[PDB]
Design a protein around this ligand. Sequence first.
Ligand SMILES: Nc1ncnc2c1ncn2[C@H]1C[C@H](O)[C@@H](COP(=O)(O)O)O1
Ligand SMILES: [Mn+2]
Ligand SMILES: [Mn+2]
Lengths: 433, 432
Amino acid sequence: LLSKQSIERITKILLDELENVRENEQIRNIINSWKPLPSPEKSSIYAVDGSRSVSRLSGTVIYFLSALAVGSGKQLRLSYANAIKSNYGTSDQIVRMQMETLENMLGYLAYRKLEGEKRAILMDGTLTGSLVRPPVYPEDIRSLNVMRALIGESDFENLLNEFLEKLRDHYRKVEEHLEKNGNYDSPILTDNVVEKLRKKYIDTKVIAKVKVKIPRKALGYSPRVIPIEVLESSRGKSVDELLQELDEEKVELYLGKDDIYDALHMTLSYIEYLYSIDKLLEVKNLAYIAKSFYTKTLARTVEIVDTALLDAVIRTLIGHEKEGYLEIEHAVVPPKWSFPDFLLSKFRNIEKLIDKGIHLAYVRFEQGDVIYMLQSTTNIEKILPLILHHKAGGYLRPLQLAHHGVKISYKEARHTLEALINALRNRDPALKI
Amino acid sequence: LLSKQSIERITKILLDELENVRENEQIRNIINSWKPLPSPEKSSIYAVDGSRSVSRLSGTVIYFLSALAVGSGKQLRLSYANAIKSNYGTSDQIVRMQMETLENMLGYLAYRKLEGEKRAILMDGTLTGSLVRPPVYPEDIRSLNVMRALIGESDFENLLNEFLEKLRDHYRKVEEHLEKNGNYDSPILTDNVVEKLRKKYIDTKVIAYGSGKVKVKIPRKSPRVIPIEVLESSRGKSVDELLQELDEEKVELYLGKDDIYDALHMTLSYIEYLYSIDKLLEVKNLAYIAKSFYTKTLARTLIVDTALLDAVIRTLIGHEKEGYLEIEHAVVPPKWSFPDFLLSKFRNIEKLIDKGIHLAYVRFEQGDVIYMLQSTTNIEKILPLILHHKAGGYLRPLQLAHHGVKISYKEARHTLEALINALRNRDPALKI
Ligand SMILES: Nc1ncnc2c1ncn2[C@H]1C[C@H](O)[C@@H](COP(=O)(O)O)O1
Ligand SMILES: [Mn+2]
Ligand SMILES: [Mn+2]
């Protein structure tokens, strides 16, 4: 009921966004370079989404990933089930990586089995959001440097290579089960293969905590500020000399066995994920759709606005409520920090994307229906109509199908899993929540 | 469905946990130190919990917060509803902080209403969990230091103390409302007071710059703490030149409005929250009860998850028996999470640092579970007061606070967006 005390202070906080949107833009002159929508071209297509569910038992998070591709062709599904012990943040970011990795895989594999003159793939989110901020950020990058420093710079390279090789083999081996059954219960590689790898590259070098050194930059800053006292302490130097030493400097550090064993796992899972973005970018027409992303850190690397916001701008200013599309003038590039130098050479389609960038456009499929954020590898002009063959209505069918189908209104493992973990040995952890 | 290889993989992963626990490092000689519950003592008590609902509109989070106290007096309650601009971590983390802010207040005020020879508060969580990894962090620290550098030390401490004051009149106003109606709709201060404090200490120190940015002169003075972007900017120069320009206060920064604003907001919330712990820390018998807790840190920082040990026993010693087991050595908090220029202001936290947190595993009845029990004082003292209220499998004031806070089916579900429908814009309200 009430809370009404707040309300205006909500409404304001809302509107004080928009009344600052129609100001700063000065309409940004762009809304009028808006181009109503092109003429449908016939394509064969697959839309895909995935959904995860998680539950905790004590220290342990238990999750079931599901990913689904619907389209011009049969229904294809990747699913995975696992448990991993919990860091409150780091965990979720791991699950979501795997989730994302399942999509990337499903996406590309789906491309390969799509026959046609005009072949396209639709995704449930933004291409940007993935590569601008890597999930598990203050873990993944830290973990790779932790690994590289662990086993050495070259030993690492082989590890990367061995693992990719395992991965290439993986996709082919997956590719089979999608033919026969059109589903797979093990889309994810890193988990099963992690133990083996460890004892090869790791278990030799390790001796029972231990000493690595990496740069101060493999984590921070946060802050983000610096003591005054240092400028005095280091002086008679040039700001340039200092910044060198600053950004450069090696900090030391100590590592237990699990710490190592985790860094390994992270490194891999990170590598796997990457390898699916690469092997995904290979898709000729790659289509990313999202009803809502948010613009923060994006207008940073330039200025743009959330769809929902925009949607209102046009309908309360230029009056439209009208169907069509608006491209953004700037093919936008990626940041290279999310991609360690020693990584990219393995995934060139990523490397490619940094040089070429993404093309973004807002879109409205109908009337008093709403505005979506389109991103694509190729150009909006080219990619857009392809998508358009499939519009059902307020929007496209196959996306609508993927969204709806992979929806879990019923968790299998709800009754199922734990009730069989009563069985094997111990029903107590099962007790729990 | 299931792979049953995945199931094996799952069972597997879990069992290693137990056996590696049954490796009995500190466990071997720990378990037989298991004591039987003491006798109950008469105590007046308020168990408190809180729940939160959130929903997204584009890049804007809507959240509704509730806290509830049930116990040896009538039912006290807090609620707050609001919106923030979404940053995946930061938003969801600032809710969380606010949530703990009510639960803490509510716990502090509930105490002050208490009648008994022994008075106690019962909280739904762990003491350690919040303060070994504070909510919204490292973000909450960088932001402080941002302002400390930005608005400068003196006018900062000026800001600190003022805000603190406003917070005192806040609590009193709250206690009042609590009395009469037993409820309050504005438990949270910062959101209402931020924009006012922005004009004072922020807008003062800044001039408009270009698109969405501002030009900020850096003051001078106790760390002086220049923002890192000041070395960034000064690149062609000698360090001596830099200080001289710092001395004469030529130096300006080009950083963005919103970042600063947000940094401010983050700062206040974080203080309104620290006030919240410092107050709740005035409670003389304060207990926290969590069935499961954990973290990768919860071993290393100087010992095990309840459910593992719960299992280990019936599967070793055969007890499955009621009782408790007190972890021997009190735990102090890691001091990094609590800025030194802050605790000066919050004694009890500062005090909590020195004295530390007593922890014990407690099984209230029979083959029921093992809750984690944490307190500002000795388990031996507190546990008796708790036990006075043992309901059943576990304590009533709490199971009430639980069931009672669950009391939200989504209110704003039909409601809020429908009256946002009104004012002018339904557009975002369209979930679009
Ligand atoms: N795990 C994770 N990392 C980064 N950004 C995320 C994540 N999950 C959701 N998002 C946000 C960021 C973008 O707006 C979009 C990316 O969708 P996607 O299809 O997942 O590429 O969704
Ligand atoms: Mn999705
Ligand atoms: Mn709770």
